[PDB]
Design a protein around this ligand. Structure first.
Ligand SMILES: Cc1cc(CCCOc2c(C)cc(-c3noc(C(F)(F)F)n3)cc2C)on1
Ligand SMILES: Cc1cc(CCCOc2c(C)cc(-c3noc(C(F)(F)F)n3)cc2C)on1
Lengths: 49, 30, 296, 238, 99, 296, 238, 30
């Protein structure tokens, strides 16, 4: 169990991190699905004015 | 490859740099 | 340890470990160092001779890929009665790399970049359908692309004297030709480009923020050399840029929220997750729930 | 802290930051059966990483009226994983055990645990001439509790139980205990379903006490079989 | 880089970057689980490894998952972190997870 | 006996044989071995110096031949009033090698194959005749073929942002150009492709049978870069694939019954022989009848 | 007789007095995965005698209208003994197989069996566009029968099935067949529950016939896993 | 032939493998 005294907060926190080792390898580069575009960005057309 | 151009920056991509130092981001301590 | 890495590292066989004073699995995140625990130290492993290459993740390969940087459509026709807002058989573009999200996000993974650019121009033409125009056919036109560096005057008409290009670099190409291709060198007045600039451009307080003056490029002016014809057309010019001979410094966190503008890094996020301001990753029922649970 | 230790044993691992040492029963380490001590001529099966790994048992609550807990081996590990499957499908086994007992509290908590591995802890009953029954002895993964920890439940004394391979969990000092038991038996191998070589007993000699906010204080037991061998393969018998 | 394990509603901003653990009155209790799907939206998606890997299609190699306890100096506990190779359902009990 | 075979084996002269205990013409099919009887042992032969090469039956030559793998026709026109079922100036194809029988049957002669693919794209255009349209002429259009690997988003419109292709491999080609040609490497996550897969794709029981997840390729999205014109056209794109650098394992019996689907090896056969379920080979009157008997 | 052969493989053994030979698929023998071909970095478990042994399946009656039988591996051996336990508790396996098919009759009996090991025998359905389902493919220890042995149930021909590692049981000649299959796969290891590397098919090309008193003529199949390895240990999943 | 490409898989077909072992299908017995 998580045992704390009366003067300590009874709820504690964990932080999780993840990383790759030297074994790691990637291949078959593609377009990342994390960025998109539905229209022109602001000021983008002003570059033609 | 061929690069019959007089300027060296006109050459193709140089994909032969296999040296790396990950410890400058993973163990940047003393 | 700086060395030459061509393949992923091999694994070594390990045995049972019970030794006092050695705790490889225990780390100290507060030091700022990533855990150095090895798979050989956490579990009992076997010998694996790893033959996976790592040449696809090289920064050169990662970034040396042509991407759309510019796309402009304009009417090629008689522009006598057109307003002073349309592109009258030509256009000028202030070169930048922040207009299209894919290349912008790939480039913004580093603080400093040094590379030569490979510029490819691809032109398409379509017959105007406005009014009662018919197909007619697609003419084989000649286009001129002129690079005007900072401080040089840019053309104001399709037939202005600026197009004679005594010293400015111009390329003349046909639509029936392959896409035009040139190379621009590393033009920065510094040793590298500043993908991000925590400063102001001028010596006064009204300058632009986040745009480095040292990284200014200039203008690309594209005109149709042919004079107009009895029927109108729509010409679309696409400009793709490919970095090469790349050097990268200070990798950065990737952008999660959608881009709002090309002038700044302003953010508002999506209305709901994922990629919302208050929730980048989509929600699940609880921390004890997995959505794609294998149930048999 | 007082000492740190890591125990890998296969695809599992345990890290302790507040330990005293670890005990090797009689100063010996588990090993495989040599050819000059073998009896069964059948070729044995040595699963290794599949069976030589930590199995964690259910935790027990550390209360004020607690008399102690015991787990008999390999009875407790029978029916657990590949070790249990190998025990069920084979007639003879042989194995040592690495035992790790875990118990932590705050610095305002006091209490002392005796963690002792009794070899051949043949139990007795209280106030009766009848011998303990099968259900009194075979408790499985859950184990049992001590009726009379004062006499060790066999008419002997708890005070002299330190003659057996043991450690202490003194909340003021450490929060874990580790004992390495080799193969203890009069025979090179044995039938796993009718005889227990070792009994791990955890006894509250000094009761748990504190004056701060009360919390549940459990005790966890992890046993890693070591150098397991199995002979006499046939159908599963459980 | 930090995992967004607390990717649940009622968690806002930085609250999604930490997992809260309290004192329980039952033994062997499950605290949380992490979906290991980088290629789909989950705690591993917005990580350096996840972000850079989502630019590629095929991956190989081993991962390390580090946990930092951020309680007070004199709060104590013991946890068990378990990785289960694919094939079945996610373990819900410690007895199944320790295997 | 592993050796280098460049020509067919030569014949040696033989004499009369009458020796007890030697019966070369007698074999044992039950052992699973093919008869080792030689022509020199069955008949009296002469010496023949054989000079026939065997380079045409090499697996590389046998399989290194471009074959149609994809063929798609779509209308290039204004698609404002078209239903959400037609290809609106673009299409996407889930790459597979089971759609056309010739290449499928040639490939399915082996259990495992490892090769690089050579992809050739050939585009033709025709003027739409629907309504009262006339010939007009054939425009010289630019097409973009983008390869979207598994997990990557595919375009939903002819002008969606996906076409900017920051990292996806794209090829831009004209109709007047020669057919486009690229090479794809051996993309399998295994050491060879599985022509046949006796398994299921997922970890549950509702997965697909016979398709190996390791052999997944992705999508090929083809669009017309040109914007539509006042008249409609029909564009047909054909994709041919040529294996090269081939390695083959575990040859299999050829398929006799006609293919029914690209997803499975289901069979029903022809109504009558040949290649019927109950009779693969056409019938004759009896086992004592030859159809093409020379009669003079 | 025509040939004699003995196959030990652990605590089991088979003797045949009327055999032809035995077949080694593609002239290769089972072996353990080398370090230069390994993928999973986990230390494997190699039970050996516990798993590398003959398991005998249920016999099938050799009738006149028999179309043939098939067993998919390792699907047939899953849930059988320590091999089944190791398959259930592990995520990856790797193994060859020594297959022995037994069938005897009298000298007044005639009949020919083709015993063939098809690699990756992906089946098809008849007269439908739907693919075979899970229950059509996964039959376990009982196996299945051939719907259309003429086309091998996949639209190919039975006449060309001799391209695969095969033997014959000709009642006039021999009463047993033996095939040694190495590890056949595009991957060094595989998940045992979703993919079958081999399919053993026994097809009655020449039907059973006699004019003496009729008796039940069964066909028995014994498979011995060889050089078994297992990686990815976790709870049993069956 | 020419192959001025930086990737080795871009080369042309390699039709020069004349080694063969038919006995692995014709005499797969002991
Ligand atoms: C970061 C970062 C990256 C860059 C480089 C972009 C290069 O921009 C261009 C483009 C897109 C086109 C031309 C160009 N187009 O046409 C001609 C020519 F034909 F006149 F030669 N030059 C020149 C430059 C510098 O700058 N900052
Ligand atoms: C068996 C077996 C054989 C194969 C290989 C088929 C390769 O499929 C393609 C095709 C047909 C076209 C492209 C392609 N078309 O265009 C482009 C580019 F222009 F974007 F580069 N790539 C890519 C692949 C992988 O996969 N499994």
């Amino acid at each position: 169990n998580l045992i704390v005294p009366s003067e300590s907060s009874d709820t504690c926190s964990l932080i999780g991190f993840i990383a790759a080792k030297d074994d790691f390898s990637l291949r078959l580069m593609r377009d990342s699905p994390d960025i998109g575009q539905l229209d022109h960005l602001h000021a983008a057309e002003a570059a033609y004015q | 490859q061929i690069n019959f151009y007089k300027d060296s920056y006109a050459a193709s991509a140089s994909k032969q740099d296999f040296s790396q130092d990950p410890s400058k981001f993973t163990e940047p301590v003393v | 340890i700086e060395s030459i890495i061509k393949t992923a590292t091999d694994t070594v066989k390990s045995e049972i470990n019970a030794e006092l004073g050695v705790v490889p699995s225990l780390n100290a995140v507060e030091t700022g160092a990533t855990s150095n625990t090895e798979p050989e130290e956490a579990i009992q492993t076997r010998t694996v001779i790893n033959q996976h290459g790592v040449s696809e993740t090289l920064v050169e390969n990662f970034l040396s890929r042509a991407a759309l940087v510019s796309k402009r459509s304009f009417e090629y026709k008689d522009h006598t009665s057109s307003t002073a807002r349309a592109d009258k058989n030509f256009f000028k573009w202030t070169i930048n790399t922040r207009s299209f999200v894919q290349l912008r996000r790939k480039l913004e993974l580093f603080t400093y970049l040094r590379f030569d650019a490979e510029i490819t121009i691809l032109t398409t033409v379509a017959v105007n359908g406005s009014g009662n125009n018919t197909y007619v056919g697609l003419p084989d036109l000649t286009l001129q692309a002129m690079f005007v560096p900072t401080g040089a005057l840019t053309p104001e008409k399709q037939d202005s004297f600026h197009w004679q290009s005594g010293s400015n670099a111009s390329v003349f190409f046909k639509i029936s030709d392959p896409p035009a291709r040139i190379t621009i060198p590393f033009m920065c007045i510094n040793s590298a480009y500043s993908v991000f600039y925590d400063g102001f451009a001028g010596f006064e307080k009204n300058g632009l923020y986040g745009i480095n003056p040292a990284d200014t490029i200039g203008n690309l002016c594209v005109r149709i050399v042919n004079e107009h014809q009895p029927v109108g057309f729509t010409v679309t010019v696409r400009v793709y840029m490919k970095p090469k001979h790349i050097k990268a410094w200070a990798p950065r966190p990737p952008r999660t929220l959608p881009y709002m503008s090309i002038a700044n890094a302003n953010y508002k996020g999506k209305e709901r997750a994922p990629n919302a301001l208050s929730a980048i990753i989509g929600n699940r029922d609880s921390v004890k729930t997995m959505p794609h649970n294998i149930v048999n | 802290s007082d000492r740190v230790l890591q125990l890998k044993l296969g695809n599992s691992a345990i890290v302790t930051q507040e330990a005293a040492n670890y005990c090797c029963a009689y100063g010996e380490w588990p090993n495989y059966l040599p050819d000059h001590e073998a009896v069964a001529i059948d070729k044995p099966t040595q699963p290794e990483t599949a069976t030589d790994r930590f199995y964690t048992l259910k935790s027990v609550k550390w209360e004020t009226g607690s008399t102690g807990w015991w787990w008999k081996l390999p009875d407790a590990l029978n029916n657990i994983g590949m070790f249990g499957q190998n025990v069920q499908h084979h007639y003879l086994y042989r194995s040592g055990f690495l035992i790790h007992v875990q118990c932590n509290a705050t610095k305002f908590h006091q209490g002392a645990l005796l963690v002792v591995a009794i070899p051949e802890h043949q139990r007795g009953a209280h106030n009766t001439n009848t011998s303990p029954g099968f259900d009194d002895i075979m408790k499985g993964e859950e184990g049992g509790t001590f009726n009379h920890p004062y006499v060790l439940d066999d008419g002997t004394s708890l005070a002299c139980a330190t003659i057996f391979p043991h450690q202490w969990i003194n909340l003021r000092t450490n929060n874990s205990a580790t004992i390495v038991l080799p193969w203890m038996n009069a025979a090179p191998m044995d039938f796993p379903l009718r005889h227990n070589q070792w009994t791990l007993a955890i006894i509250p000699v000094v009761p748990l006490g504190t004056r701060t906010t009360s919390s549940m204080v459990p005790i966890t037991v992890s046993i890693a079989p070591m150098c397991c061998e199995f002979n006499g393969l046939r159908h599963a018998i459980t | 880089s930090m995992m967004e394990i607390n990717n649940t509603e009622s968690a806002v901003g930085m609250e999604r970057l930490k997992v809260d653990i309290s004192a329980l009155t039952d033994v062997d209790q499950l605290l949380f689980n992490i979906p290991l799907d980088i290629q789909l939206d989950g705690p591993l998606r917005n990580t350096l490894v996840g972000n850079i890997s989502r630019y590629y299609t095929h991956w190989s190699g081993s991962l390390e998952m580090t946990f930092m306890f951020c309680g007070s100096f004199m709060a104590a506990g013991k946890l068990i972190l378990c990785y289960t190779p694919p094939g079945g359902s996610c373990p819900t009990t410690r007895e199944t997870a320790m295997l």
